Design a protein around this motif. Structure first.
Motif, PDB file in Angstrom:
ATOM      1  N   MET A 206     -19.338  10.013   1.832  1.00  0.00           N
ATOM      2  CA  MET A 206     -19.442  10.903   3.017  1.00  0.00           C
ATOM      3  C   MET A 206     -20.047  10.247   4.242  1.00  0.00           C
ATOM      4  O   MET A 206     -20.126   9.022   4.347  1.00  0.00           O
ATOM      5  CB  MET A 206     -20.263  12.135   2.661  1.00  0.00           C
ATOM      6  N   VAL A 207     -20.458  11.097   5.173  1.00  0.00           N
ATOM      7  CA  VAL A 207     -21.087  10.656   6.404  1.00  0.00           C
ATOM      8  C   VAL A 207     -22.567  10.988   6.337  1.00  0.00           C
ATOM      9  O   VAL A 207     -22.958  12.158   6.244  1.00  0.00           O
ATOM     10  CB  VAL A 207     -20.407  11.324   7.612  1.00  0.00           C
ATOM     11  N   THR A 208     -23.404   9.954   6.361  1.00  0.00           N
ATOM     12  CA  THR A 208     -24.836  10.125   6.215  1.00  0.00           C
ATOM     13  C   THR A 208     -25.561   9.654   7.463  1.00  0.00           C
ATOM     14  O   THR A 208     -25.090   8.768   8.189  1.00  0.00           O
ATOM     15  CB  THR A 208     -25.347   9.356   5.004  1.00  0.00           C
ATOM     16  N   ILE A 209     -26.722  10.253   7.686  1.00  0.00           N
ATOM     17  CA  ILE A 209     -27.642   9.837   8.728  1.00  0.00           C
ATOM     18  C   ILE A 209     -28.685   8.955   8.074  1.00  0.00           C
ATOM     19  O   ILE A 209     -29.458   9.417   7.226  1.00  0.00           O
ATOM     20  CB  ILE A 209     -28.304  11.041   9.403  1.00  0.00           C
ATOM     21  N   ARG A 210     -28.724   7.696   8.475  1.00  0.00           N
ATOM     22  CA  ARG A 210     -29.593   6.748   7.802  1.00  0.00           C
ATOM     23  C   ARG A 210     -30.115   5.748   8.813  1.00  0.00           C
ATOM     24  O   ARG A 210     -29.908   5.880  10.020  1.00  0.00           O
ATOM     25  CB  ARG A 210     -28.873   6.062   6.643  1.00  0.00           C
ATOM     26  N   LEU A 211     -30.840   4.766   8.302  1.00  0.00           N
ATOM     27  CA  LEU A 211     -31.480   3.783   9.146  1.00  0.00           C
ATOM     28  C   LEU A 211     -30.679   2.489   9.131  1.00  0.00           C
ATOM     29  O   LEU A 211     -29.875   2.239   8.231  1.00  0.00           O
ATOM     30  CB  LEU A 211     -32.908   3.551   8.665  1.00  0.00           C
ATOM     31  N   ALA A 212     -30.898   1.669  10.152  1.00  0.00           N
ATOM     32  CA  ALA A 212     -30.312   0.338  10.224  1.00  0.00           C
ATOM     33  C   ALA A 212     -31.422  -0.603  10.666  1.00  0.00           C
ATOM     34  O   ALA A 212     -31.974  -0.439  11.757  1.00  0.00           O
ATOM     35  CB  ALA A 212     -29.140   0.305  11.193  1.00  0.00           C
ATOM     36  N   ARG A 213     -31.755  -1.556   9.806  1.00  0.00           N
ATOM     37  CA  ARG A 213     -32.689  -2.614  10.157  1.00  0.00           C
ATOM     38  C   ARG A 213     -32.083  -3.528  11.208  1.00  0.00           C
ATOM     39  O   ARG A 213     -31.273  -4.405  10.894  1.00  0.00           O
ATOM     40  CB  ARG A 213     -33.037  -3.417   8.907  1.00  0.00           C
ATOM     41  N   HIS A 214     -32.497  -3.334  12.458  1.00  0.00           N
ATOM     42  CA  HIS A 214     -32.040  -4.155  13.578  1.00  0.00           C
ATOM     43  C   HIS A 214     -33.257  -4.673  14.323  1.00  0.00           C
ATOM     44  O   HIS A 214     -33.755  -4.052  15.261  1.00  0.00           O
ATOM     45  CB  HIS A 214     -31.131  -3.384  14.515  1.00  0.00           C
ATOM     46  N   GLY A 215     -33.715  -5.841  13.922  1.00  0.00           N
ATOM     47  CA  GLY A 215     -34.901  -6.385  14.521  1.00  0.00           C
ATOM     48  C   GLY A 215     -35.083  -7.828  14.146  1.00  0.00           C
ATOM     49  O   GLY A 215     -34.124  -8.603  14.131  1.00  0.00           O
ATOM     50  N   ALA A 216     -36.313  -8.191  13.833  1.00  0.00           N
ATOM     51  CA  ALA A 216     -36.665  -9.567  13.581  1.00  0.00           C
ATOM     52  C   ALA A 216     -37.478  -9.658  12.295  1.00  0.00           C
ATOM     53  O   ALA A 216     -38.015  -8.665  11.795  1.00  0.00           O
ATOM     54  CB  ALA A 216     -37.427 -10.131  14.778  1.00  0.00           C
ATOM     55  N   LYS A 217     -37.570 -10.876  11.771  1.00  0.00           N
ATOM     56  CA  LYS A 217     -38.213 -11.094  10.485  1.00  0.00           C
ATOM     57  C   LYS A 217     -39.631 -10.545  10.498  1.00  0.00           C
ATOM     58  O   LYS A 217     -40.394 -10.784  11.439  1.00  0.00           O
ATOM     59  CB  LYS A 217     -38.233 -12.584  10.167  1.00  0.00           C
ATOM     60  N   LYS A 218     -39.967  -9.775   9.465  1.00  0.00           N
ATOM     61  CA  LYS A 218     -41.301  -9.199   9.318  1.00  0.00           C
ATOM     62  C   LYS A 218     -41.577  -8.148  10.379  1.00  0.00           C
ATOM     63  O   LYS A 218     -42.597  -7.455  10.326  1.00  0.00           O
ATOM     64  CB  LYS A 218     -42.368 -10.282   9.398  1.00  0.00           C
ATOM     65  N   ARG A 219     -40.668  -7.998  11.336  1.00  0.00           N
ATOM     66  CA  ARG A 219     -40.807  -7.040  12.427  1.00  0.00           C
ATOM     67  C   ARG A 219     -39.537  -6.211  12.470  1.00  0.00           C
ATOM     68  O   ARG A 219     -38.707  -6.343  13.377  1.00  0.00           O
ATOM     69  CB  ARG A 219     -41.075  -7.741  13.758  1.00  0.00           C
ATOM     70  N   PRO A 220     -39.349  -5.359  11.472  1.00  0.00           N
ATOM     71  CA  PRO A 220     -38.258  -4.392  11.505  1.00  0.00           C
ATOM     72  C   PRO A 220     -38.325  -3.458  12.704  1.00  0.00           C
ATOM     73  O   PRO A 220     -39.397  -3.127  13.215  1.00  0.00           O
ATOM     74  CB  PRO A 220     -38.442  -3.636  10.188  1.00  0.00           C
ATOM     75  N   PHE A 221     -37.138  -3.065  13.157  1.00  0.00           N
ATOM     76  CA  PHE A 221     -36.961  -2.100  14.237  1.00  0.00           C
ATOM     77  C   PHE A 221     -35.693  -1.340  13.901  1.00  0.00           C
ATOM     78  O   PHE A 221     -34.589  -1.871  14.054  1.00  0.00           O
ATOM     79  CB  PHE A 221     -36.852  -2.770  15.599  1.00  0.00           C
ATOM     80  N   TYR A 222     -35.857  -0.107  13.449  1.00  0.00           N
ATOM     81  CA  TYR A 222     -34.766   0.665  12.887  1.00  0.00           C
ATOM     82  C   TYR A 222     -34.048   1.447  13.964  1.00  0.00           C
ATOM     83  O   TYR A 222     -34.668   2.034  14.860  1.00  0.00           O
ATOM     84  CB  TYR A 222     -35.283   1.629  11.822  1.00  0.00           C
TER      85      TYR A 222
END
Ligand SMILES: [Zn+2]
Lengths: 50, 156, 82, 121, 205, 129
Positions: free
Chosen positions: C1-17
């Motif tokens: 299905m279609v879910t609302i979720r997170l995407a890790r878009h950042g830098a090492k050790k410094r996640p930015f979802y």
RNA sequence: CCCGCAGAAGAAGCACCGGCUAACUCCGGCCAGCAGCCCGGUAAUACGGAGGGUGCAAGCGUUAAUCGGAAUUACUGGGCGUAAAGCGCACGCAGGCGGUUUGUUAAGUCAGAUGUGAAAUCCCCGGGCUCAACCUGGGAACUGCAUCUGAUACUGGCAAG
């Protein structure tokens, strides 16, 4: 003496169009006053009126 | 007051019965840091005299120019016989962009902020002639206002 | 299905979802239908580390969507932040 | 030169051939020296230029100049080559100090370029 | 990553005084400032067009103590930015933390300033900044930290600075040992001898 | 055969200015005429006059200042083998604007700067300088 | 990441200096040697070594390869009397071009709008890592394509001259 009775910045440069200490040895920038000199840059008779 | 730039020197030869007789040629140019400019092309057996001759020649046969504050008045081309030249007024700070003898002519001319390239041959002499040409052909906004019978504001 | 979720878009050790609406089967940081907010776990003070476009969330859920637990947790926080 | 003509048959890019095909776009290649020898230069030089024909790894046979004063090279001598042509029919350079090739002896400048170790003193 | 050799040699090569030594003792006494370095110093033939430009570039680089890649990067940045390319570059150079420190007078030389910066002596807005290339912004107070405030070198540097006239674009306090970088300097505030235009041209090859 | 009369007009003007002819003349056309309008309106010419019923004859009267010609240069830009259409944002400047560039737009013929003001591009007929 | 300890301690090379092209002197025989293009035969700034020097810098050089410079395929931006370059001359299909005036249409063309033009990448303005690199919000752009509404100067088509 900098800066005593016979100063540089307060009055003028001993030599005509020369920083007494060291910069401007031609006829282009008459007036610049660098940190190393604390000196104006005009005529030899300019100190007689100042 | 006038400054002066010996652009180029070149040794040249005459073949004779005995051998090769060398003289020298001196391409100098001068400007007062304002519109005026002039170039001298002298020749002599020895270099010093040749350059002095060119300095003489340049001092005379100068030519006035209309120079917007520190730059040109518009994009121009100018040509001499193999050296065609494109200069374009350039923003304050940019400096004089040009390759060689052209750089010198501009430098004495007093201009400060340009974009200049040279199409075709780079023979110092011809190309400096082309520079002086493209500088002489150039007209100022007041001067167009005059030619055309108008106010400058009319032209903007 | 279609879910609302997170995407890790950042830098090492410094996640930015970035929270996104995307089909489930697509990879984590892969094909997403759309992006409805973001989460900055490593957010410093006096900055909003979190921001959510709630109606666009609220539209999708009505479209019949699934919500990652974290995303749920984040919504609650805002409603409670609110 | 016409637009239409270029349309009809467009401009052709001058394909330049590599001048080191035996390398086949390898920065170097290994070989075995089928024969070492020297050869004389085209006018106006005068030397007994050391050289060696090398059968390559890939199967090309070529000949390789030899830089430096004095090498160790023999037949059945496994070597590496790098390319670079000497001014006839020679296009390639022996890397001194590689796989059988010694480094030049008693050199102290450009010790890299002939595979010579820093001196210790 | 730094030039570690003879400093006055560089100055000699350039022609001018680069201010690579504190200025207690005059440069003419320490070295033959007119004569170029090496065996062939007294000989001085007129340089080429390229060569003069190169020399100019070196001078500027030498003055600030910036190696080539970094310099190139700076130039590029300047070009990218709006305004006079050369003056932008100059401004950028000035903006360096070490340079700023030197200007303030916490280092006798620029080298000294750089060293200080490295050794976690200097703070920018109350946060210890260790990078000499750190571009100090407008209204960014920059100070000596309480550990390095006791050093005799710092006071000497300050004294030296005092003998030399002050830059208008800063405001420094000798007792507090904290200076405010008020604004990025105008071209007029900097030295007139530096032909930035030549430098610009060199990179516009 | 004749392939472009706008070209012919510009050439004739060029040559009359070159030759120190007071005026120049040629077959008349509407576009030709509105161009002559324009040029007058920008004061490169003293006046044009069309004459004739059947195959009327346009006559431009040239202009000389301090002897030399006043149309320093005139050059077509679009042409039947290659047309040249521009958007308003794309309008050139002639001589850094010390000149003009004639352009047709849907609202008739007119120079570049008037077009800019109007806010609409079209066909760049020719530069004049 | 911060705090404590000691002591300059444990930390600089490569390439080049004939010109191009920044950097010059001495010592060793067309050999040995160099070389990107244009030195060596006894005074070599061009070979090798020392000295000095120049430029890069934890790298420096060679080789390989792409764009540049190269306007040296020239759309922007080239040329053909003697330098390469006008068919030996003609007719002529396809094809390209098309005098002038009116009417129309709106195809090209311009204007406006809708849809799209993944994200990322580039760049503009910002934020976050002690800075940078890096991460990162927001824009911008993605020059383009499709659909709507218009304009009618031109080009085009249709009709009349
Ligand atoms: Zn002075």
């Amino acid at each position: 003496e900098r800066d005593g009775l016979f100063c540089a910045r307060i009055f003028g440069p001993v030599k005509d169009y020369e920083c007494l200490c060291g910069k401007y040895k031609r006829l282009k920038h008459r007036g610049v006053i660098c940190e190393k000199c604390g000196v104006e840059v005009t005529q030899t008779k300019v100190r007689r009126e100042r | 007051e006038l400054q002066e730039k010996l652009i180029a020197v070149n040794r040249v030869s005459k073949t004779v019965k005995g051998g090769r007789i060398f003289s020298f040629t001196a391409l100098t140019v001068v400007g007062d840091g304002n519109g005026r400019v002039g170039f001298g092309y002298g020749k002599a057996r020895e270099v010093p005299a040749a350059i002095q001759k060119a300095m003489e020649k340049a001092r005379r046969n100068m030519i006035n120019v209309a120079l917007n504050n520190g730059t040109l008045q518009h994009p121009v081309k100018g040509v001499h016989t193999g050296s065609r030249v494109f200069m374009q007024p350039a923003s304050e700070g940019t400096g004089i962009i040009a390759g060689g003898a052209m750089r010198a002519v501009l430098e004495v001319a007093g201009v400060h902020n340009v974009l200049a390239k040279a199409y075709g041959s780079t023979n110092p002499i011809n190309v400096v002639r082309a520079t002086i040409d493209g500088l002489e052909n150039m007209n100022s906004p007041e001067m167009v206002a005059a030619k055309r019978g108008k106010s400058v504001e009319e032209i903007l | 299905m279609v879910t609302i979720r997170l995407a890790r878009h950042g830098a090492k050790k410094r996640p930015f979802y970035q929270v996104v609406v995307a089909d489930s089967r697509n990879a984590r940081n892969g094909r997403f239908i759309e992006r409805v907010g973001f989460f900055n776990p490593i957010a410093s003070e006096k900055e909003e580390g979190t921001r959510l476009d709630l109606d666009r969330i609220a539209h999708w859920v009505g479209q019949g969507a699934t919500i990652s637990d974290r995303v749920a947790a984040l919504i609650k926080e805002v409603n409670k932040a609110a | 030169a016409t637009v239409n003509q270029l349309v009809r048959k467009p401009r052709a890019r001058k394909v330049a051939k590599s001048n080191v095909p035996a390398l086949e776009a390898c920065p170097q290649k290994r070989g075995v020296c089928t024969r070492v020898y020297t050869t004389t230069p085209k006018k106006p030089n005068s030397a007994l230029r050391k050289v060696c024909r090398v059968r390559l790894t890939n199967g090309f046979e070529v000949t390789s100049y030899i830089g430096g004063e004095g090498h160790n090279l023999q037949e059945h001598s496994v070597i590496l080559i790098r390319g670079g042509r000497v001014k006839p029919g020679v296009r390639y350079h022996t890397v001194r100090g590689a796989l059988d090739c010694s480094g030049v002896k008693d050199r102290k400048q450009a010790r890299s370029k002939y595979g010579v170790k820093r001196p210790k003193a | 990553a730094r030039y570690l050799g003879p400093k006055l040699k560089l100055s000699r090569r350039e022609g001018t005084d680069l201010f690579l030594k504190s200025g207690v003792r005059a440069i003419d006494t320490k070295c033959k400032i007119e004569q170029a370095p090496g065996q062939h110093g007294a000989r001085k033939p007129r340089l080429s067009d390229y060569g003069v430009q190169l020399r100019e570039k070196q001078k500027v680089r030498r003055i600030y103590g910036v190696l080539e890649r970094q310099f190139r990067n700076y130039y590029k940045e300047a070009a990218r930015l709006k305004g006079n390319t050369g003056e932008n570059l100059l401004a950028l150079l000035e903006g360096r933390l070490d340079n700023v420190v030197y200007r303030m007078g916490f280092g006798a030389t620029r080298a000294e300033a750089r060293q200080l910066v490295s050794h976690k002596a200097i703070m920018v807005n109350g946060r210890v900044v260790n990078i000499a290339s750190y571009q100090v912004s407008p209204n960014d107070v920059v100070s000596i930290r309480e550990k390095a405030k006791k050093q005799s070198r710092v006071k000497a540097a300050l004294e030296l600075a005092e003998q030399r006239e002050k830059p208008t674009w800063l405001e420094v306090d000798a007792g507090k040992m904290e200076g405010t970088f008020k604004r990025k300097p105008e071209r007029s505030d900097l030295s007139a001898d530096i032909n930035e235009h030549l430098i610009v041209e060199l990179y516009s090859k | 055969s004749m392939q472009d009369p706008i070209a012919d007009m510009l050439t004739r003007i060029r040559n009359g200015q070159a030759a120190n002819k007071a005026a120049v003349t040629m077959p008349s056309s509407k576009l030709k005429v509105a161009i002559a309008n324009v040029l007058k309106e920008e004061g490169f010419i003293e006046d044009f006059k069309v004459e004739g019923d059947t195959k009327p004859e346009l006559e431009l009267t040239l202009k000389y200042f301090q002897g030399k010609a006043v149309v320093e240069s005139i050059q077509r830009v679009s042409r039947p083998g290659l047309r040249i259409y521009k958007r308003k944002d794309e309008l050139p400047k002639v001589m850094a604007g010390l000149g003009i560039a004639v352009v047709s737009t849907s609202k008739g013929v007119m120079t570049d700067r008037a077009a800019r003001q109007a806010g609409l591009g079209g066909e760049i007929i020719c530069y004049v300088a």
